[PDB]
PDB file of C-alpha atoms and ligand atoms in Angstrom:
ATOM      1  CA  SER A   1      88.505 116.606  61.886  1.00  0.00           C
ATOM      2  CA  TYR A   2      91.017 113.919  63.069  1.00  0.00           C
ATOM      3  CA  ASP A   3      89.131 110.997  61.404  1.00  0.00           C
ATOM      4  CA  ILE A   4      91.844 108.858  59.702  1.00  0.00           C
ATOM      5  CA  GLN A   5      89.183 107.066  57.540  1.00  0.00           C
ATOM      6  CA  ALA A   6      87.122 110.090  56.328  1.00  0.00           C
ATOM      7  CA  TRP A   7      89.050 110.465  53.033  1.00  0.00           C
ATOM      8  CA  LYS A   8      87.436 107.343  51.525  1.00  0.00           C
ATOM      9  CA  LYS A   9      83.856 108.646  51.418  1.00  0.00           C
ATOM     10  CA  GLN A  10      85.144 112.116  50.488  1.00  0.00           C
ATOM     11  CA  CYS A  11      86.896 110.495  47.452  1.00  0.00           C
ATOM     12  CA  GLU A  12      83.725 108.535  46.542  1.00  0.00           C
ATOM     13  CA  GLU A  13      81.737 111.788  46.544  1.00  0.00           C
ATOM     14  CA  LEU A  14      84.384 113.576  44.444  1.00  0.00           C
ATOM     15  CA  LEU A  15      84.370 110.703  41.904  1.00  0.00           C
ATOM     16  CA  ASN A  16      80.545 111.049  41.710  1.00  0.00           C
ATOM     17  CA  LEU A  17      80.950 114.771  40.873  1.00  0.00           C
ATOM     18  CA  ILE A  18      83.659 113.926  38.247  1.00  0.00           C
ATOM     19  CA  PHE A  19      81.283 111.392  36.582  1.00  0.00           C
ATOM     20  CA  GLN A  20      78.557 114.230  36.381  1.00  0.00           C
ATOM     21  CA  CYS A  21      81.115 116.569  34.669  1.00  0.00           C
ATOM     22  CA  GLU A  22      80.729 116.376  30.830  1.00  0.00           C
ATOM     23  CA  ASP A  23      84.518 116.888  30.744  1.00  0.00           C
ATOM     24  CA  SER A  24      85.061 113.362  32.208  1.00  0.00           C
ATOM     25  CA  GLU A  25      83.441 111.630  29.133  1.00  0.00           C
ATOM     26  CA  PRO A  26      86.781 110.602  27.499  1.00  0.00           C
ATOM     27  CA  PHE A  27      88.187 109.288  30.856  1.00  0.00           C
ATOM     28  CA  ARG A  28      85.194 107.307  32.289  1.00  0.00           C
ATOM     29  CA  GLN A  29      86.520 103.948  30.956  1.00  0.00           C
ATOM     30  CA  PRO A  30      89.785 102.393  29.652  1.00  0.00           C
ATOM     31  CA  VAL A  31      91.011 103.958  26.347  1.00  0.00           C
ATOM     32  CA  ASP A  32      89.696 102.241  23.151  1.00  0.00           C
ATOM     33  CA  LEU A  33      92.746 100.338  21.851  1.00  0.00           C
ATOM     34  CA  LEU A  34      90.862  99.532  18.560  1.00  0.00           C
ATOM     35  CA  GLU A  35      90.279 103.282  17.744  1.00  0.00           C
ATOM     36  CA  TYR A  36      93.775 104.364  18.999  1.00  0.00           C
ATOM     37  CA  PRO A  37      95.940 101.524  17.621  1.00  0.00           C
ATOM     38  CA  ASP A  38      99.245 103.190  18.727  1.00  0.00           C
ATOM     39  CA  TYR A  39      98.011 104.057  22.282  1.00  0.00           C
ATOM     40  CA  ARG A  40     100.113 101.410  24.175  1.00  0.00           C
ATOM     41  CA  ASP A  41     103.250 102.393  22.128  1.00  0.00           C
ATOM     42  CA  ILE A  42     103.037 105.864  23.848  1.00  0.00           C
ATOM     43  CA  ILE A  43     101.400 105.031  27.268  1.00  0.00           C
ATOM     44  CA  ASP A  44     103.084 102.538  29.609  1.00  0.00           C
ATOM     45  CA  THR A  45     100.313 102.544  32.331  1.00  0.00           C
ATOM     46  CA  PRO A  46      96.703 103.196  31.154  1.00  0.00           C
ATOM     47  CA  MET A  47      94.356 104.675  33.807  1.00  0.00           C
ATOM     48  CA  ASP A  48      90.707 105.801  33.870  1.00  0.00           C
ATOM     49  CA  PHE A  49      88.113 106.869  36.465  1.00  0.00           C
ATOM     50  CA  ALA A  50      86.235 103.551  36.486  1.00  0.00           C
ATOM     51  CA  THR A  51      89.511 101.789  37.416  1.00  0.00           C
ATOM     52  CA  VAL A  52      90.124 104.394  40.179  1.00  0.00           C
ATOM     53  CA  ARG A  53      86.573 103.879  41.579  1.00  0.00           C
ATOM     54  CA  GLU A  54      86.892 100.065  41.465  1.00  0.00           C
ATOM     55  CA  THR A  55      90.334 100.215  43.235  1.00  0.00           C
ATOM     56  CA  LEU A  56      88.803 102.402  45.959  1.00  0.00           C
ATOM     57  CA  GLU A  57      85.740 100.146  46.459  1.00  0.00           C
ATOM     58  CA  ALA A  58      87.954  97.005  46.500  1.00  0.00           C
ATOM     59  CA  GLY A  59      89.809  98.516  49.518  1.00  0.00           C
ATOM     60  CA  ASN A  60      93.022  98.640  47.491  1.00  0.00           C
ATOM     61  CA  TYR A  61      94.003 102.258  48.261  1.00  0.00           C
ATOM     62  CA  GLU A  62      95.648 102.800  51.703  1.00  0.00           C
ATOM     63  CA  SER A  63      95.577 106.660  51.439  1.00  0.00           C
ATOM     64  CA  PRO A  64      94.152 109.476  49.369  1.00  0.00           C
ATOM     65  CA  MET A  65      97.724 110.182  48.113  1.00  0.00           C
ATOM     66  CA  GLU A  66      97.637 106.872  46.246  1.00  0.00           C
ATOM     67  CA  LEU A  67      94.251 107.687  44.650  1.00  0.00           C
ATOM     68  CA  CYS A  68      95.577 111.175  43.740  1.00  0.00           C
ATOM     69  CA  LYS A  69      98.626 109.603  41.982  1.00  0.00           C
ATOM     70  CA  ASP A  70      96.336 107.433  39.803  1.00  0.00           C
ATOM     71  CA  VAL A  71      94.005 110.372  38.922  1.00  0.00           C
ATOM     72  CA  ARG A  72      97.059 112.493  38.011  1.00  0.00           C
ATOM     73  CA  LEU A  73      98.174 109.601  35.721  1.00  0.00           C
ATOM     74  CA  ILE A  74      94.858 109.913  33.780  1.00  0.00           C
ATOM     75  CA  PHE A  75      95.826 113.554  33.057  1.00  0.00           C
ATOM     76  CA  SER A  76      99.527 112.946  32.280  1.00  0.00           C
ATOM     77  CA  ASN A  77      98.533 110.124  29.878  1.00  0.00           C
ATOM     78  CA  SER A  78      96.174 112.552  28.043  1.00  0.00           C
ATOM     79  CA  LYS A  79      99.006 115.138  27.775  1.00  0.00           C
ATOM     80  CA  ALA A  80     101.409 112.471  26.420  1.00  0.00           C
ATOM     81  CA  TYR A  81      98.921 111.143  23.797  1.00  0.00           C
ATOM     82  CA  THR A  82      97.638 114.556  22.454  1.00  0.00           C
ATOM     83  CA  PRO A  83      98.774 115.501  18.894  1.00  0.00           C
ATOM     84  CA  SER A  84      98.474 119.189  19.993  1.00  0.00           C
ATOM     85  CA  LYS A  85      97.671 121.332  23.098  1.00  0.00           C
ATOM     86  CA  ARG A  86      94.725 122.681  20.969  1.00  0.00           C
ATOM     87  CA  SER A  87      92.868 119.307  21.095  1.00  0.00           C
ATOM     88  CA  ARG A  88      89.329 118.598  22.418  1.00  0.00           C
ATOM     89  CA  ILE A  89      90.179 115.620  24.668  1.00  0.00           C
ATOM     90  CA  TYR A  90      93.377 117.221  26.106  1.00  0.00           C
ATOM     91  CA  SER A  91      91.448 120.501  26.611  1.00  0.00           C
ATOM     92  CA  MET A  92      88.751 118.575  28.597  1.00  0.00           C
ATOM     93  CA  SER A  93      91.566 116.961  30.635  1.00  0.00           C
ATOM     94  CA  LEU A  94      92.945 120.377  31.678  1.00  0.00           C
ATOM     95  CA  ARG A  95      89.581 121.686  32.959  1.00  0.00           C
ATOM     96  CA  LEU A  96      88.849 118.409  34.745  1.00  0.00           C
ATOM     97  CA  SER A  97      92.362 118.428  36.339  1.00  0.00           C
ATOM     98  CA  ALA A  98      91.739 121.976  37.697  1.00  0.00           C
ATOM     99  CA  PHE A  99      88.390 120.820  39.154  1.00  0.00           C
ATOM    100  CA  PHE A 100      90.009 117.709  40.720  1.00  0.00           C
ATOM    101  CA  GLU A 101      92.939 119.625  42.232  1.00  0.00           C
ATOM    102  CA  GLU A 102      90.576 122.277  43.714  1.00  0.00           C
ATOM    103  CA  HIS A 103      88.529 119.529  45.478  1.00  0.00           C
ATOM    104  CA  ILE A 104      91.298 117.031  46.505  1.00  0.00           C
ATOM    105  CA  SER A 105      93.456 119.583  48.396  1.00  0.00           C
ATOM    106  CA  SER A 106      91.237 119.608  51.561  1.00  0.00           C
ATOM    107  CA  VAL A 107      90.934 115.769  51.428  1.00  0.00           C
ATOM    108  CA  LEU A 108      94.754 115.416  51.477  1.00  0.00           C
ATOM    109  CA  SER A 109      95.270 118.132  54.128  1.00  0.00           C
ATOM    110  CA  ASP A 110      92.674 116.620  56.497  1.00  0.00           C
ATOM    111  CA  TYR A 111      94.087 113.098  56.098  1.00  0.00           C
ATOM    112  CA  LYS A 112      97.678 114.201  56.734  1.00  0.00           C
ATOM    113  CA  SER A 113      96.545 116.277  59.784  1.00  0.00           C
ATOM    114  CA  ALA A 114      94.664 113.180  61.144  1.00  0.00           C
ATOM    115  CA  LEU A 115      97.777 111.020  60.817  1.00  0.00           C
ATOM    116  CA  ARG A 116      99.902 113.642  62.561  1.00  0.00           C
ATOM    117  CA  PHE A 117      97.326 113.811  65.414  1.00  0.00           C
ATOM    118  CA  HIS A 118      97.385 109.972  65.725  1.00  0.00           C
ATOM    119  CA  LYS A 119     101.220 109.984  66.151  1.00  0.00           C
ATOM    120  CA  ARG A 120     101.173 113.054  68.543  1.00  0.00           C
TER     121      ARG A 120
HETATM  122  O1  ZKU B 201      89.191 106.290  23.685  1.00  0.00           O
HETATM  123  C1  ZKU B 201      89.197 107.048  24.656  1.00  0.00           C
HETATM  124  N1  ZKU B 201      88.231 107.019  25.590  1.00  0.00           N
HETATM  125  C2  ZKU B 201      86.951 106.492  25.385  1.00  0.00           C
HETATM  126  C3  ZKU B 201      86.739 105.112  25.385  1.00  0.00           C
HETATM  127  C4  ZKU B 201      85.464 104.654  25.146  1.00  0.00           C
HETATM  128  C5  ZKU B 201      84.447 105.554  24.902  1.00  0.00           C
HETATM  129  C6  ZKU B 201      84.753 106.898  24.903  1.00  0.00           C
HETATM  130  N2  ZKU B 201      85.987 107.388  25.132  1.00  0.00           N
HETATM  131  N3  ZKU B 201      90.163 107.986  24.811  1.00  0.00           N
HETATM  132  C7  ZKU B 201      90.899 108.528  23.671  1.00  0.00           C
HETATM  133  C8  ZKU B 201      92.303 108.893  24.106  1.00  0.00           C
HETATM  134  N4  ZKU B 201      92.241 109.996  25.071  1.00  0.00           N
HETATM  135  C9  ZKU B 201      93.131 110.999  25.144  1.00  0.00           C
HETATM  136  O2  ZKU B 201      93.538 111.369  26.242  1.00  0.00           O
HETATM  137  C10 ZKU B 201      93.471 111.798  23.983  1.00  0.00           C
HETATM  138  C11 ZKU B 201      94.212 112.921  23.851  1.00  0.00           C
HETATM  139  C12 ZKU B 201      94.132 113.313  22.498  1.00  0.00           C
HETATM  140  C13 ZKU B 201      93.331 112.397  21.874  1.00  0.00           C
HETATM  141  O3  ZKU B 201      92.911 111.465  22.777  1.00  0.00           O
HETATM  142  C14 ZKU B 201      91.088 109.927  25.982  1.00  0.00           C
HETATM  143  C15 ZKU B 201      90.592 108.509  26.105  1.00  0.00           C
END
């Protein structure tokens, strides 16, 4: 698999699977700043899966590493905002992070292998 462009559709498919996960519910759209009035005191850079999908479709990611950084920001924001590790939304974030990491590893490996083959 030395296709330099294959990661994009692989990331679209993975986002589709994350949207089917019930555990993505709290992360499908920008955080509700009315409900969580302190949110932007705690979180410098909001991120959500709809923003990640729109950035991908706009052609504004150059690599799957950049997409992976934004998805990891969704999860670090949830860990920063949680009042406890025994919270529903943080708990959903941890299962969804495990699912994401399990699926993104081959996407990153294949991309990096394709770049190395291009420069051979
Ligand atoms: O308001 C939303 N998301 C939303 C927006 C509109 C409809 C449904 N859900 N949050 C709450 C903050 N959040 C956290 O990570 C967190 C950790 C502990 C408590 O909340 C997830 C995102």
